């Protein structure tokens, strides 16, 4: 046991990622939104979470007319405020975790939303 | 319907899936709060980091352990660590799997009671079972006749077992583990000049310990050797960029385990609580409990102890009994390995504390089911 | 309802509109009044010229700055400068737009208190907000982890920032900047013959400094190089028509920044304040503060400053640590750009100091809202 | 043959003669050197000024302390301080008297090693002995059961002692002494307007602190009182003739000793390192360690400290335990008084480190004899 757990965790992450991205793609394709291919890079700027979340809820969500990093973090703050307003209780989920693309966390809040609605 | 096995230790939490052979995800169990003033309006800053996240975003944080000396001294955030493990690290629904928890012997009853209450009334597990940490070790080692000695960051047991018959009058507990070794190392680092004070620096001291400290075979000899400078020194390199060179405080940190007076304690070292735990057993048992000393737990991974312990015991036990120290290479995850085994035994499904039993009995059912 | 972002530094007043990417109006913050005798019965000679107007007609004026070293000395005319900005340059009744002012760290409380009292009780702005400069510089640079070296004409202050969490126990504020460099330059010219004494002559010396002075790389070597007369000399043409030729003192004026002993100060040059402000922060933060040293402000627009700074910092940082100096091309306006970004965010709107709140609490509300 | 007891602190140097009741000559331990240009041919301008002489001629000097946080940084000028205090202050021949030196707990070994090396190989004293400070404090207080709290200009440490038996596993060193208080004060004056940058001005701020700052009893209540301007203000007359009026920051400066979050430190104030040190001892000792809390060292000479300390402790200790702080009126020289007592004991005079022992063993002998 020369610390083989690395590969086990990575394969677990892969099998979670495939199902998660299939679910989010099937949800994007209902409202006429373009599908995505990368779970961990096409969620940096925090925009695709916003329209996805409004399609999950059914309301409007504005976006900041910017492109720098602080704009991404403001979008993700919006996402987390919206999520909290629906009593979705996340713990180690912050604005910087998404924008840094943290695998262990970037598919933690997706599972939270999934478990909340689905 | 698989079950969960989370060896919620006192240092790093190690959780995973029953039946498997390795924890899916391990991580230090520290919850951190940011302490400096936050001035950036558009940030999505959380208010409580936990796990490797808190370990990384460390300079802004007051790291704190919820579990101390095996017992849980903060239920507010131990709940946070469990939430983290269930939803972010494994991403599973608690309402679907039964959970297996571990614990140390001679722990307050309120600990396991509240543990069960929280695992039912908050995560709604269908079934939960809390086992003693030094028996899953025997399961994992495959034996049935040994004297486990697990330790690290909070405790040090000795649960002598003859044949599925633990001898509960001969279990010695001793609170002399990784955290106390860490603090002692941090305190002797001062005399060279280096001064680590905050928690963000206690982490660096722990990491110095893990990869520099070894256990002397003969302490009074190694000390006199390290006096005339030799190959003893090493060089760790902080995240600051500066390097340090500890040469002597490498076997003087883990020598605490064998001389607990180094930190101001009466209790005898781990090389002697083992012998006392044996001598409390029966004569017809010692003659082979000597021959199965299953070491477990984290802090038993120094490049030393697997031999200095044997050397120190064969100077106590009679000159005839044959002594042997079973130190498997993964003597760290052995508790969780045993957990993944025990949760997957056919003859075990009549042990869990089903939710019906909790509702018809209250939380005080753990004492009678375990 | 777009807001206003008027960063009124010690020297130039850069104002504009929240949201855009450039300040509309830029002009020095001087208030000139005539001194010579006026003999013309019909002229509409105004009372006090202010702005680049008062710069062009500086032959018969006594130019004078209201802001000295960040703090505000004369309020009767700073009111005039704000009035000018609002009514002649931008031409916008402030009663509609909010306003975002900028200050410096470690400034007398009464400064920002009177500033907001004036803004509400003389312009009736609907809401105002005063934000520290070296945070807006990070905003503009799009970072969240830097150590902002801001310096122009009034101050030179670092503010280390890790992730939106500034460390107010480590901001160093050296009070040496463009105006002191200009005074030293005009004091060091006179060893060749050229004498600049009046305030107009001081503006001329500044117009020299801005376009003939660079920063040496190895100052001691550049001395002996320019000793044997070489390509160093330049020729600048005063508004009179005559020419001058400064050869040596074009790199000794900004070497003051790195050795403030040239002007009798005791402090350490802008490199050691940066290194000390880094060493005050935590070990985990030093690694990635060493890599993002966002320069800002005017005075850091000297030609060879991004390299002298880097060499000087690498000379005292650890050997294995990576140093990078983030010197954007238009760093002069970086503070205002960050201000425009900050006021144009959506989350920010709950941070303004509504006029109602000022009527409730009074001027002390700034210390608790900012 | 009498002996020398020089409590070479980290601020003032209190030296004298073994046996007496008061030090001969005390003086700040600052070595100053001129920085301005000297133009007068016929002067006896000394190279470097040291002591109260330098403290008199500041406006020419760069005052630097050799000792920072207990440890000695510059070994060149500390030699000058000892030379001064042996010849110009006491006017004694060092080759005749044995010398007693003091130190703080948890200091680099190299500190006392080189201290001995300099004391023998340079001054050729007949014998030398370095004793921990907070033990001499008990000596002078005439007790044998206390928990000293030594603190001034440097380190702050407790040394619990039960019956001549120190408990080395329960001392709690902390680097939050008067120098950090002074720097925080001269950082917090800037709110009112007065800036003090140079070292010659840092002395002025220390002097303001020493005779204007008290310790609140209830900090929040005192703060809420100072908001409605009242009898808190006090005026101080600089050596320039101007006056300043610090109202609020008369307790906000020494409140650091209890909330070291005001400087970015993580540790808990002196009211709680004391309680932690007591709880680290044994149960049978806590009952009469709570009774004798000897305070020593300068920084414990604020007005309201023997009361806020007592309240803050009795708010922690069990409800049925009698707390008493022993704060003598000479709690500033108590360390040296204990030194004079000790060096004049008929029993002790065979514990020195005679020159023979140093020459036969080497500088590593202080760890053996102390
Ligand atoms: N290789 C090693 N050498 C020395 N000490 C170690 C090593 N690995 C881990 N430790 C110590 O063991 C502790 C973790 O042990 P572990 O048994 O995982 O704790 P827990 O019982 O809480 O799970 C750490 O705090 C560390 O101090
Ligand atoms: N092109 C330049 N080269 C060198 N120095 C300059 C240049 N432009 C401006 N400066 C210096 O910068 C100062 C103005 O800086 P600025 O950023 O306007 O300060 P503030 O923050 O007060 O607005 C002037 O005093 C001048 O000395
Ligand atoms: N009356 C006073 N009130 C508060 N602080 C004082 C007073 N007198 C001295 N101090 C502080 O005590 C320090 C010197 O105390 P001392 O115990 O002599 O230090 P050391 O142990 O280094 O000699 C000074 O730095 C000063 O800050
Ligand atoms: Mg373990
Ligand atoms: Mg600027
Ligand atoms: Mg003292």
Numbering used by the authors:
A (entry chain F): 18 to 135
B (entry chain B), C (entry chain D), D (entry chain C): 5 to 374
Question: What text appears in the publication on this structure?
Answer:
The cytoskeleton protein actin can flux between globular (G‐actin) and filamentous (F‐actin) form, and this polymerization cycle is coupled to various cellular functions.
The UTRN‐ABD contains two calponin homology domains (CH1 and CH2 domains), and previous structural and biochemical studies have proposed both the domains are necessary for actin interaction (Winder et al, 1995). From our F‐actin‐bound structure, we could redefine the boundaries of ABD sites; ABD1 (amino acids 18–33), ABD2 (amino acids 107–126) and a newly identified ABD site in between ABD1 and ABD2, named ABD2′ (amino acids 84–94). The binding site and architecture of UTRN‐ABD‐CH1 are similar to the recently reported FLNaABD (Iwamoto et al, 2018); however, in our UTRN‐ABD an additional amino‐terminal helix is visible, extending toward the barbed end of the actin monomer. To validate our structural model of the UTRN‐ABD:actin complex and the newly defined ABD1 (amino‐terminal helix) and ABD2′ region, we performed mutagenesis of key interacting residues and co‐sedimentation assays with F‐actin. The decrease in affinity by V87D and N109A mutants indicate that the core binding is mediated by the ABD2′ and ABD2 sites. Co‐localization analysis shows that the UTRN‐mini versus UTRN‐ABD labeling of actin is nearly identical.
